[model samples]
Target: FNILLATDSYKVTHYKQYPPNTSKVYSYFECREKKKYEETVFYGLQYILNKYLKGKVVTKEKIQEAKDVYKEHFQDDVFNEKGWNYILEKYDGHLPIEIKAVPEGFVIPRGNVLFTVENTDPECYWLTNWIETILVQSWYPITVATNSREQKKILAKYLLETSGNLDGLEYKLHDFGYRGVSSQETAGIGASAHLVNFKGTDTVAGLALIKKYYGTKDPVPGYSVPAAEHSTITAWGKDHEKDAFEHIVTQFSSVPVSVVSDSYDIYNACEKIWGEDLRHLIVSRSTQAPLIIRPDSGNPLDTVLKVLEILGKKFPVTENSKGYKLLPPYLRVIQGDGVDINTLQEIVEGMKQKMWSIENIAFGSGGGLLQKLTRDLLNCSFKCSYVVTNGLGINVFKDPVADPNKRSKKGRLSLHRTPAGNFVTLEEGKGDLEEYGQDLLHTVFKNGKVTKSYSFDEIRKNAQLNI
Candidate 1:
């Protein structure tokens, strides 16, 4: 137990050496060191190890108590020798190591390991193991979300040309990844990724977590304009269809309205229930604001198309006196369950070929955009290279490869995009060399503190403007 205590204490402290202000809310401009900080790595390790050592530890009470303790000490480190010694008596014969990954949303290529974990002490290999999964799991979803958002930005811009300011369409990002993700945190972060793309999310809890931690505004809450901030909660169900639809309309009358219509018959349901009963209320009462009709099943493209046709026939496209077909004021086709960047491209292109109006087409992506995409495609890999690991152990960092394709230009790198479309490379001491139209990956995490704060709206705006 003593040995276990020492091992665990050292491993936990390694990641906890940073100050508390590092993760302070609304501190996005914080220096790199501070911004990369996460106390969960330490706390999670401690709790998991402690519970594992306790043996067959299964209880809501125990888990909650451990979590409460973890939260209390989130900003602190654990260094109890006696406790660890007791655990070490039960020796699992393992060492603990520290692992840090590249900042999320980094565009990395294949063969470039994101980050590597090695035994701090050669003999402690088994003790420090099993931490890599959590690291990879934490990073991959963010990377995918960022990369997918990159493509979605392109798609949004393309659709915006014909649809007009789809900026309000930000409320339709997919959120189904929660069902597919390995854990609750992963699902929440996956939703964060969706918000990063300015895609609206259906997972209220995920949105709440992102807002609470990342200091971002839940688009739904703000867009829905409820009495309190969190009042804009919505849901979907098989048996609670009528209740779900009525609750959304009754509670969220002013802001944009969306409902899952695929429980029984998507087209018929939207036409019969939502379109007929609540549709006019949404329009007239919403200041001509549109209500988004969402379809959560079937081929996303076909479903969207059918939903659009039904909306058009039931709602009918208003016409100008000159007989020009006037576009409807506030109708949107929200596609859930099966929309991705590539699928979005297909749907838009298909609509174009048929000359169908895509003005109302909006997407709600789930697993594909959130969790299914891997680290490789998103270019998210973190590597820690040592430069002059002297007696002081202050390992100076440098990107091992710097070919632009494989080039890791040493010293603080700033990303610049050339007008002609290329990523301009500029090292801290070096001037601009070339442009590849790629964004550099560093952000504001410094000295255990965040220097700037970014709301979901801000990240989403950045997502849109980046394209």
Candidate 2:
């Protein structure tokens, strides 16, 4: 029996092994073959028979007929003997594979492996290597998803605490690190990680995958907005001062607009625009509707102070506007460019101390959330320990960071929340082993098929419940 093997060019392109950016390697081969077949098939019998007869199985005589028509050009079957022969010789009697892992959303602290994959049949070590890419990639998405969800929850709690209302808040958690993930499949999976926490995404393709596999909703509730949402005003020289002020009033018209006010002449832009254009519209519209002054390239603290001063001096007679003078003041300033969690906290705390009303400062942190937080909080990685050995095999499992402080329990294990409200840890049974800790990883896939399908909505609800 002969098997026709084809490379998955989509996977190859996604993994960056191909130039045309395809995922399946076989597609690339087929495409090249077909093009040549089309150009030459009309003029040559070799092209005609080789193209049509190569993949089909027939009687010996029919095979010979096709081969004779196509000049009997048999290529050596190098891979046929290599891969399956190796598998048959070594892994004829392999043991069942067992894996132990933390559930998605488990609050794992520093120094935990989070999961381990091991093969029971020592001879099938190479088979285990095949599982490494998918298994290891699978774990991190869940781990990072868990951490990203928790971080957002913490920030949400803070917002609810500091302000009485939770109306009209928006965020876009973009996976700018898709270029950085090791492979295309990893990027596709990383997108799953982002959806696990964030409201929505700018990568429209990712949104489609979430809905396709995870049953997420289209337009993803709470995140749909107009393109004008990103419009901004610049504090250039006095040349465009009136134009900048009118840009906000005319375009957004009482909407919560974000304006960049640290250009050549910020103070002048603020002084002229505050009273004539921004003042009455801000107070008359609603207390919740305040414009955001974004500072891209300046001392955030000083920039925020100057914007607040301009608001105070111009609206409701500058300082006496009912909203501004209402004891606890209100002026919105949204920071961009170099904002991070620590910097945001520092600016918030610093301004709050000086009675400058830091409550209105929002942030559009780019690399900070995707790069810093994932690298620092979620240290998820996957490694394979053994390759094919003697026909009967036992594979060792080791956590990458296995210091006593960060040690993973030895042996196959399970995780269960104790009835008394603690985590129950279970170990896999060896004949000599007496008891189990608890079970975490369970039968997600059975007999090379998915046993259950979970919707993004279901995962989201489950995440909320665990919290």
Candidate 3:
């Protein structure tokens, strides 16, 4: 795909509008302070770089295509025909820009610089902010990573209090959003972001993204179980619900598997079919693999408790070291529906109050994982904060009267951890990138080549919870 074609139409007019002597435009992308989470896990820049922004993207044919499209698309010829040709001649189609970012997967507070883009060649000033439309996509992966990381914190707390360790913690939250997401790229990037904190996912494209961009190899990045959706159960007809359940358990025997129990009556399936009739198939199998019951209908909070309670009585239970009731190794629950940030909290805390171990259940998410967010989820913005013209640099910013939150940062910036133990964004014109020994920002890309590429393991360790 032509990189220029992916950008907004208005950006094509920016090159001519800048000051005649303007040599460089330096802009930064950040998540403003107001957000659902106090911090975000930096991720997916490599995916964007590899997929869209890297290498010889500006061919003459693409430039011609863009120019042809813009000639008729505009009232007057507003296309930067000369500038695109100049870039092609001078740099051989590589972008004349350097992109600096906080190391991928590093956790940082809101209102901090996550990445910076600056045109390298003097004549390419407009290229910096012109790509903001595409660069702003960092919001999606960052939002997913932030939400999933925070969810891990909440879920792990309950696990530690009950089961007393982080065993199988990475598998606690599974990705169930492939079909629910809007596009293939959405599922690919969203699930990859979620995998930063958890190992479970059903989206195959996530694994592909990691393998392609994130230096992932050997040990895979995501894990999925053999699971059945409503179609499989309903296909057997209402009268044969137990038969459908029996078929799957026998088919995918000796491993962790899931079944959507809400295709018929959830309580009847849980209480009678799974709890009584099929109880021995699960218990007698030496695999001791979990049979994850899915009750996605009705009130999730009540449904999970009742399902866990009903199954607990039928399968025998053991008390953990913390004295919380633990389900047998073979039986667990996965609630995939209506699982948002707030509702998940409600369900887990409710289970804790009922003296159930967090290990007794896991979570699967569709819309909540992939589709429930936007760029504003973290108030993400990419703005030109500094510019250089005729060898002179000028600090630039916006302070709006109507909405203070809409204001942008001023000047070239750097992110650093203070001696006071918090990450801070400082203006380079006033202070320095070198003055702070602890500046977390590093130049990852320069003049259209990736200078730094992170491995999936390196990223995981950066955001690793506990040890």
Candidate 4:
């Protein structure tokens, strides 16, 4: 796709609509209000910068293509040919704008300025908002991260309550959303966002995206274990289902692997085949890795409880310090079906109610993790707030006659932490250099160069809930 044309048609004419004497335009990107969560994680902007706005983006050929398309599409001479040439000449085809943002992976409360954009050159005032459509896409990663972190809150609560610690917490919630999402890029980006809070995933595209952009010197970006899908098990036919089970167990016996136990009768498979037949191979006498049994159908909460109860009876169960029962280290269960945020919590609550340690179960979510979200979840928006006219700075804002909730912030903005340790946004340039805990927002990009970049591990630590 041509970068110059990656905007709405109406924005092609926006260069002519700024205030008559406008010299510099300033805007901020924010999650205007909190809906699902009070705080949001700042992420994915680095991807936007590296992918869309870096290193001599404007080109004569690209400008000509936009001119050709806009000339016919609009039937008007609205293409900014002069501006394009000026950018090509003055800035050598690089954007003449500055982008400042909170460090990627840091979490801040909603309704705060997550990032700011301003035209560095007075002649290029229109460039700031022209690119707003793309930069605002920071919403995707931010929203995904916020939702994942909130889910982490739920998962961690039960783990701490039942297991008394967060061991293997990162691997508890695995990303199985690569095939369920809209496109390849969405899976790569959204799945990578999920990794901001957890380390387990089956999406290879996410692993590649994270490594390419974030530079992990570590051996792997995220991890997954061997597993069988419905096709692999169902192809064996119903008669030899036990053979399928036996073959899979011993094939991957040395490493942790999951099996779709519900391909036939989940209850019967858990009881007779796995419980009685294969029990010897996976239990005490055998040296093996944990066999993660997957229950793929039925009511998630009820099925998990029944399966756990059956497995507990046939195998050995241990009581931990928290008075919760855990399955033997070699045997565990994973619930992959009907696992959304609501169902995830429901299953956890049910397990706790039965005194089964949360450690005894893991979750695999697909559509729930990467597909079930909209931009309005956090009210993400990019709006112009400050402008300079005739060399004088003027703060700009909008408050609809009736809806104050849509009102925008005014003037240059700064995010600060008060003496009492609370996040507060100081507006109208009030806290620019006021020494309010050294402003959380920093200059991260300017004039086609990344002023700062965070490593993958650096971001994971920042996004981690230190509590």
Q: What overall lDDT goes with each candidate model? A: 0.46, 0.41, 0.86, 0.89
In the range 285-321, model 1's lDDT, one tens digit per residue, is: 5534456666778887777667766766777676433
Cα lDDT tens digits for candidate 4, 1-467: 67779988899999888888788999999898732588998889999888889889988899999999999999998988998889998988889889989888888988999899998888899898999889888899999888989889899999999998998888888999989999999999998899999989998898888888887778777888899998888889879888888898788878888999988799999999999988887884232479899999988999999999999999889999999999988888999887888999999999999999999999999998898988888999999999989889988999889787789999999998888986888899998679787778888889989888998788888899766
Q: What local lDDT score does residue 447 receive in model 3, on the 0 to 100 scale? A: 74
Per-candidate clash tally: 66, 35, 0, 0
Q: Residue 120 CA error for candidate 3 (Å)?
A: 1.1
Instruction: Return the candidate ranking by lDDT, descending.
Output: 4, 3, 1, 2
Better of 1 and 3 by lDDT: 3
Candidate 3, residues 182-290, lDDT tens digits: the string is 9998999999899989999999999988887886666789888899988999999989999999999899887888999998689889889988888878886553577
Global fold similarity of model 3 (TM-score): 0.97
> How does each model score on TM-score?
0.54, 0.61, 0.97, 0.97
Model 2: runs farther than 4 Å from truth? 1-81, 84-124, 138-147, 164-192, 200-205, 217-238, 254-256, 265-268, 275-277, 280-290, 316-331, 355-359, 373-377, 383-409, 428-438, 465-467
lDDT for 15 (candidate 2)? 22
Better of 2 and 4 by lDDT: 4
TM-score of 4: 0.97
Among residues 3 or more apart in sequence or in different chains, the pairs in candidate 4 whose N, CA or C atoms overlap within 3 Å are: none
